[PDB]
Design a protein around this nucleic acid. Structure first.
Lengths: 110, 117, 56, 39
RNA sequence: GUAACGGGGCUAAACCAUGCACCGAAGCUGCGGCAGCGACGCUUAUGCGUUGUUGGGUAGGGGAGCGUUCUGUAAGCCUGCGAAGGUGUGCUGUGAGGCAUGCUGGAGGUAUCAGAAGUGCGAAUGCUGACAUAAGUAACGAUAAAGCGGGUGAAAAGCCCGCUCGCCGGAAGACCAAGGGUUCCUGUCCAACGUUAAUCGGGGCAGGGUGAGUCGACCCCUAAGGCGAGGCCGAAAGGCGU
RNA sequence: CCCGGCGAGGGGAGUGAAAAAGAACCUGAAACCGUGUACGUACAAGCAGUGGGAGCACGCUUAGGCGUGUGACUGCGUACC
RNA sequence: GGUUAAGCGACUAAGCGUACACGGUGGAUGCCCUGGCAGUCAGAGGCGAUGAAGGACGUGCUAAUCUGCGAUAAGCGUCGG
């Protein structure tokens, strides 16, 4: 059966995070946990925390046997954007967007 | 007596967009382009309804000319001979016979050749 | 210089076709402790090529 | 409680600065180089 | 850049004369349907039948209609057997349109015939909000400069201790009056702010701190100047002055 | 009760007619951005459509073929105010 | 059966298009109302040297923002409901 965990309003742009998520699409849990540890990106920490939390859910709420779980679906999508002001030359001013993201991982024993 | 234009405009816009399914790019997502695409498409359809009746006659003429030269006669002489024998077969039917029945086509051809005499 | 017509969402995708990154696959096991590490790097508990090292 | 209040109220403020930032006198003085097709 | 047949190619696939075939348009004919304007007959209105002829269209004139909110018909009719709204599908009118139904939705909606309009949007370098592109590109604010060990910590290049190195030194040092108004000190927190991270901060929160006969105001005296009882002027307001 | 930094954000349990009413909280459209499924695409030149038209996949079907999606190849074709 | 030739040729998707299904962002649309607009019918058409209109600082068990009040300070006396 399926089990889900979500990180909402993660402080990172959606485009950057999606690069990490491509690696672990459709692998086994152990291999994914290995790959995320030895990749040097800020996003890799967030995805790994989410994946570990999802693993924990599938054992304590649902059944067991973490030894054959797989990553079935994973996707990222944009969240609300904060706006801020940054000055420029000659009195002009510019807009700044601080984008966020939502993180979901689908782990199942199929 | 104030009237708001929400539902009416929304329905009118949705009517046009549903007519533009399968169009590339923004030509199927934004109204200002879908409108022009649909108007064009209507114009082209109206124009093509006249052209369709010409392409098929073109094709039939080609096929009849091909089949006639197999039996040692040109298309123009064949057609002229058919009328001197007072035979009224539609060109579409002649092409169909040429494709699907060679014996019948030869039966017509020899008669036309005799009509020319 | 600026663009005259905004590029499509297709051209944006085509350019990004080389932005995908790669995994490692070069995971090695230590002789003695048996834990994982990269090639030519010391493991987490200070074990290189079986023989114990600094391990602070 | 410094979560939904501070973030969004700060976000609100920036609009007036962009709006009042335009009140600057954007005269450029003039176009400083010679006229395009002068006398 | 061939380029003074549209090309390929052509001694006829060139040019005169004659002839017969065939191709070729939304033109004409055939079949089916709609709408006018007359004529002719029945009902002698409407309702019809039999004919003839007509229908490219800007500025512009004339004639017909669809739909939206509100008032009467209304204590009427439809409404958990699911209203308005949102979202698909299927039928049918020449058109603006109409009807039925699946899913969301969870409380209101209006036959029919009349009345009144804030009555229909793609454009006006139109107004307000939201979201894109260029692009994960340019930049991160003086070229005075950093290296190592330990500590705390989930995480240390940037914080705290220690050693070494480098810079300023009529200043990048120590004070005062203006101006500012708690930014000062201690303990706690890291989600926003700090152009990166942050255990740190002039950031959030809670406590604490500014003691005068002699220093400064206030006080006594006047300069430039201001106000000004009476007073002199001036439509009014007011101007100048002892 | 569990993962996590005695975080933020989640997955359960529980209240409620309804939590896809969970405090950014009635309903919740469009531009914009994603995951999955079916077909097409790496010898091919232009307002991107329209008229023909193989093949593939799904549904119905008693043949016979219909319905939905896509569209190889070919004729014509230089947006709107 | 093999070995040679000559001819024809399914199967790839780094990514992209269309359709369909499921989502995110954003807040239109529908439905509401102690908020406004335009009026009929009555009232009153002034307050102030017994210190006005308008304000400053204070006032609670807890410290403030609103509402009241004035060192007798979210209130004091008397007569009625």
């Amino acid at each position: 059966m399926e089990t889900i965990a979500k990180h909402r309003h993660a402080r990172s742009s959606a485009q950057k995070v999606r690069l990490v998520a491509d690696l672990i699409r459709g692998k086994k849990v152990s291999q994914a946990l290995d790959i995320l540890t030895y990749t040097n990106k800020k996003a890799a920490v967030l995805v790994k925390k989410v994946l570990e939390s999802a693993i924990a859910n599938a054992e304590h709420n649902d059944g067991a046997d973490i030894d054959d779980l797989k990553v079935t679906k994973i996707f990222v999508d944009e969240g609300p954007s904060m706006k801020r002001i940054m000055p420029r030359a000659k009195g002009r001013a510019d807009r700044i967007l601080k984008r966020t993201s939502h993180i979901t991982v689908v782990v199942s024993d199929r | 007596a104030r009237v708001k234009r929400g539902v009416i405009a929304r329905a009118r816009h949705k009517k046009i967009l549903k007519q533009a399914k399968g169009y590339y790019g923004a030509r199927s997502r934004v109204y200002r382009v879908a409108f022009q695409a649909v108007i064009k498409a209507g114009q082209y359809a109206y124009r093509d309804r006249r052209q369709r009746k010409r392409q098929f006659r073109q094709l039939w003429i080609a096929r009849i000319n091909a089949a006639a030269r197999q039996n040692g006669i040109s298309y123009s002489k064949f057609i002229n001979g058919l009328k001197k024998a007072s035979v009224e077969i539609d060109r579409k039917i002649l092409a169909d016979i040429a494709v699907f029945d060679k014996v019948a086509f030869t039966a017509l051809v020899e008669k036309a050749k005799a009509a020319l005499a | 210089a600026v663009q005259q017509n905004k590029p499509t969402r297709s051209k944006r995708g085509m350019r990004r076709s080389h932005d995908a990154l790669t995994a490692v696959t070069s995971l090695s096991v230590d002789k003695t402790s048996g834990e994982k590490h990269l090639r030519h790097h010391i493991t987490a508990d200070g074990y290189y090529r079986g023989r114990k090292v600094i391990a602070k | 409680m410094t979560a939904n209040s501070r973030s969004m109220n700060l976000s609100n403020s920036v609009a007036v600065t962009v709006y009042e930032a335009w009140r600057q006198l954007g005269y450029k003085g003039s176009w400083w180089w010679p006229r395009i097709r002068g006398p």
